[PDB]
């Protein structure tokens, strides 16, 4: 049964090129059949190309989206708001947890946010189903900043160009893989084990 025909290719991963850099993230097509479709649908639409980061709290979370600036975003493709899917099957393992933003329990919209630390204060307030990749350093240097100068907050960062495309990534260390993790990427809440991307959530 199809309420909204995508009729296109929706990669499980998308890249958001912002005024600061690029933020690549994926949706949980694994466990969240709604959330993955919602973000993907708006991605292949071209909704993020007019969205901005509205809430940037250091070591907290970074809310991104809401083209309207009212707290519920656009999301006019499905008309109304969607049921409360509030159930983090994953856990706040570290920083880099991509979650879905909403104005109420079932007032879920097309907005999202990334957590700079293990968020247990929104476990049942925001449905969490996402993973950030190859952009955690940006999310870090963007989430840690509050002011640009005097008493002026860091000028609003927005998503300049956003397109759905699968970034896999590949590493290596034949003979001495002392490092590990060639590139960027947040923590993995899907593996259900505690680990941090770059210490920012534990330090």
Describe what this molecule looks like in 3D.
GO terms for molecular function: disordered domain specific binding; peptidyl-prolyl cis-trans isomerase activity. With 203 residues, the chain is mainly beta. It has helices at 35-45, 136-143, and strands at residues 13-18, 22-27, 52-57, 61-65, 97-102, 108-115, 128-133, 147-149, 152-153, 159-164. The protein has two helices and ten strands; from the N terminus they run E-E-H-E-E-E-E-E-H-E-E-E. Strand 5 and strand 6 form a beta hairpin. It is globular. The relative contact order is 0.23.
Order of helices and strands: EEHEEEEEHEEE
Quickly give the CATH architecture. Answer: Beta Barrel
Taken as a percent bin, the fraction of beta residues is 25-35%
Distance between the termini: 47 Å
Radius of gyration: 16 Å
- The helix count comes to 2
Number of domains: 1
Q: Predict the CATH topology.
A: Cyclophilin
- Shape by Cα distribution: globular
Q: How many runs of DSSP E, i.e. beta strands?
A: 10
Largest sheet: 8 strands, antiparallel
Structural class by helix and strand composition: mainly beta
CATH class, anyone? Mainly Beta
**Corresponding CATH superfamily:** Cyclophilin-like
Q: Percent range for helical residues?
A: under 10%
EC number: 5.2.1.8
Keywords: Disease variant, Intellectual disability, Isomerase, mRNA processing, mRNA splicing, Nucleus, Phosphoprotein, Rotamase, Spliceosome
Binding site for cyclosporin A: 54-65, 70-71, 99-104, 109-113, 119, 125
Catalytic activity: [protein]-peptidylproline (omega=180) = [protein]-peptidylproline (omega=0)
């Amino acid at each position: 049964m199809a309420a909204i025909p995508p009729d296109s290719w929706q990669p499980p991963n998308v890249y958001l090129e912002t005024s600061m850099g690029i933020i690549v993230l994926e949706l949980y097509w694994k466990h969240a059949p709604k959330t993955c479709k919602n973000f993907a649908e708006l991605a292949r639409r071209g909704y993020y190309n007019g969205t901005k980061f509205h809430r940037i709290i250091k070591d907290f979370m970074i809310q991104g989206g809401d083209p309207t600036g009212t707290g519920r975003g656009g999301a006019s493709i499905y008309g109304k708001q969607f049921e409360d899917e509030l159930h983090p099957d994953l856990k706040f393992t570290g920083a880099g947890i991509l979650a879905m933003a909403n104005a109420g329990p079932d007032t879920n919209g097309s907005q999202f946010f990334v957590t700079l630390a293990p968020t247990q204060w929104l476990d049942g307030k925001h449905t969490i189903f996402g993973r950030v990749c190859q952009g955690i350093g940006m999310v870090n240097r963007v989430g840690m900043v509050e002011t640009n100068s005097q008493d002026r907050p860091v000028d609003d960062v927005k998503i300049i160009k956003a397109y759905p495309s699968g970034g896999g990534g590949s590493g290596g260390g034949s003979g001495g893989g002392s490092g590990g993790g060639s590139g960027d990427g947040g923590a993995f809440p899907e593996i259900h084990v505690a680990q941090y991307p770059l210490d920012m959530g534990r330090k």
